[PDB]
Enzyme design. Structure first.
Site, mmCIF file in Angstrom:
data_model
loop_
_atom_site.group_PDB
_atom_site.id
_atom_site.type_symbol
_atom_site.label_atom_id
_atom_site.label_comp_id
_atom_site.label_asym_id
_atom_site.label_seq_id
_atom_site.Cartn_x
_atom_site.Cartn_y
_atom_site.Cartn_z
ATOM 1 N N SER A 46 0.779 -1.235 0.000
ATOM 2 C CA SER A 46 0.000 0.000 0.000
ATOM 3 C C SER A 46 0.816 1.294 0.000
ATOM 4 O O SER A 46 0.248 2.388 -0.145
ATOM 5 C CB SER A 46 -0.884 -0.006 1.251
ATOM 6 O OG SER A 46 -1.918 0.951 1.144
ATOM 7 N N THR A 185 1.524 3.877 5.348
ATOM 8 C CA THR A 185 1.884 2.527 5.789
ATOM 9 C C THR A 185 1.780 1.554 4.629
ATOM 10 O O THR A 185 1.172 1.868 3.600
ATOM 11 C CB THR A 185 0.976 2.104 6.946
ATOM 12 O OG1 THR A 185 -0.378 2.346 6.561
ATOM 13 C CG2 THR A 185 1.269 2.892 8.225
ATOM 14 N N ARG A 229 5.856 -1.088 12.635
ATOM 15 C CA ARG A 229 6.299 -0.326 11.468
ATOM 16 C C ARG A 229 6.233 1.176 11.719
ATOM 17 O O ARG A 229 6.915 1.931 11.033
ATOM 18 C CB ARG A 229 5.532 -0.672 10.199
ATOM 19 C CG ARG A 229 4.083 -0.237 10.292
ATOM 20 C CD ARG A 229 3.113 -0.992 9.407
ATOM 21 N NE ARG A 229 1.725 -0.557 9.631
ATOM 22 C CZ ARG A 229 0.814 -0.855 8.700
ATOM 23 N NH1 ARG A 229 1.190 -1.496 7.600
ATOM 24 N NH2 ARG A 229 -0.446 -0.511 8.895
#
Lengths: 243, 243
Positions: A46, A185, A229
Site C-alpha cells: 500500500s 503505511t 512499522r
C-alpha cells in the site's frame, strides 16, 4: 549514506529484521541502521498508493481532489472500506479495491511509462495490473522510497504540481503549527516463516523550517507485530529530536 | 440561510455577544444563531492572513511553498517574531512583521484588486497598507467568510489552483483518517465593554465525504474569554453531530 549502529537498539528488542533510512534536508544526507538492507528491494504493497494516486490524477482516471469513490454496497475485505471515500480517505484507510480499479483504468502501458519516469524500484509490473504491487514482481528499496518521496516533496516527479500537491495533502497524518507529518503505511501479508512478508512506513516530517525524509521496512510473518512499522521509526525520530 | 436561536444559550452561558454561521456542503445551506449579526461586518484581524498569503503567492512576493521567512535580527517585543518560519508556521503563529511586509510588498493597487476579485467584505483597505485589516476600515461578515472559504475550498478563487492548494495545506490544523480541518483564528485585541474588540474562528471540516464551512465572531472585552472563539463553535458542532 552512513550506518548508525545504535538504531539497532530499537530493532533488537522485538527481534526485528528491518531497516530505517532517515534523511535530513535531502537524500544526500541519509543515515540507516543497516546499509545492506537499505537498498534491498521489497514488495511496496500500500505504499504504492502514492505513485498510483499521482498516476491516476495524471492520467485523468481520478478526476480531481474532491472526487468521491462511491461504495457499491458490496462486500469488501475491511469494514473500514465499506463506505464512500475521498482520495485522502481511501489513501488513509488504504482502501485497496479503489486503487485496484484505478490501476485497471490506468492500464499496463501507462503504468509502465510512469514507473520509468518515477524510477520506481525494479519497475516490473508483471503479475497482473491490479496486483503487481501486492503479489507480483514489483520491488523497491527504502532508499528508493526516500528518493521518490523527496521528488514528491519538491514537486519534481514528472506529474503536474497540482497533482503532486493534491497527493501531499492526502498524506498528512499529523498537524501542529510548527510540525507536519506526511506518511503512508504498507503491509504485504505474513508470507511464510521462510519467506516473510514486508511491512512499511514511509514519509517525511516538516518541523519548523527543517524537513526529514524516512522509509522503514521490516520482515513480518506475524500480524501482531504490525504496529512496530510505526513505533520503531517514531522512537528513532523522537530520539533524534524530531519531536 | 436560516436562524437557529437555540444556539444562543452557548453565547449567554459565557455572557458573550457573538455570531456563528455553519454550512453543510455549500454556502446555500447555512444556519446561524443570529441573522442580523451574521451579516454584520467586523475587522477580519488575523483571518486576513488567508487572502494575504494567497495574494503574496499570486504576486510572486512569496516565492513558493518552501519559502522560509527569515528573522533579520528584528528587535521585536515578541519572542515569536524572532524565529524563522515556513509559510505554514507564519500562518499558524503570531508573525506580525511577516504579514505587514507581505502587504507593503503586494501594495495597495494589487491588494485592492484581489480583494475585489475575492469579494472580501466591504473591500475597504483604508487605514494604512500594513494595518487596514486590524485597525483600519476593512470589515467582513461571518457569511462572507464562509463564501470565501468555500471558493478557496473549490479552488475557485481568482488565483492559481497551485497557490490555492499551498494556502490550504498551511491551514490544516486537525487530521485523522476521515477527518480533516482547515481553520484560522483571528483577534483584533481586547477592547472595553462599550468598545469591544473582535475575535474570530473560521474554516472548514472535512468529515468522511462531507464538508462543513463555518465562521464565528464575538465581541471581546475580556482577555479570559478568548478561547471561547473555539469552544462555543466546537460546542455547536458537537451538538449538530459533526464532532
Amino acid at each position: 549514506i552512513t550506518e548508525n549502529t545504535s538504531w539497532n537498539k530499537e530493532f533488537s528488542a522485538e527481534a526485528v529484521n528491518g531497516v530505517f533510512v532517515l534523511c535530513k534536508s535531502s537524500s544526500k544526507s541519509c543515515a540507516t541502521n543497516d546499509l545492506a538492507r537499505a537498498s534491498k528491494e521489497y514488495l511496496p504493497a500500500s505504499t504504492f498508493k502514492i505513485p498510483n494516486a499521482i498516476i491516476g490524477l495524471e492520467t485523468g482516471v481520478i478526476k480531481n481532489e474532491h472526487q468521491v469513490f462511491k461504495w457499491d454496497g458490496k462486500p469488501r475485505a475491511m469494514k473500514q472500506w465499506e463506505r464512500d471515500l475521498t482520495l485522502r480517505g481511501a489513501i488513509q484507510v488504504s482502501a485497496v479495491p479503489v486503487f485496484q480499479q484505478i490501476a485497471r483504468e490506468v492500464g499496463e502501458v501507462r503504468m509502465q511509462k510512469y514507473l520509468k519516469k518515477f524510477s520506481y524500484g525494479n519497475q516490473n509490473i508483471s503479475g497482473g495490473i491490479d496486483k503487481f504491487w501486492l503479489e507480483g514482481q514489483l520491488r523497491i528499496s527504502a532508499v528508493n522510497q526516500v528518493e521518490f518521496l523527496e521528488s514528491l516533496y519538491l514537486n519534481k516527479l514528472s506529474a503536474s504540481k497540482e497533482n503532486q500537491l493534491i497527493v501531499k495533502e492526502a498524506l498528512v497524518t499529523e498537524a501542529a503549527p510548527e510540525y507536519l507529518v506526511h506518511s503512508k503505511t504498507g503491509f504485504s501479508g505474513v508470507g511464510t516463516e521462510s519467506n516473510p512478508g514486508v511491512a512499511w512506513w514511509v514519509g517525511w516530517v516538516e518541523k519548523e523550517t527543517e524537513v526529514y525524509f524516512f522509509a522503514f521496512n521490516m520482515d513480518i510473518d506475524n500480524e501482531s507485530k504490525l504496529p512496530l512499522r510505526k513505533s520503531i521509526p517514531t522512537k528513532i525520530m523522537e530520539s533524534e529530536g524530531i519531536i
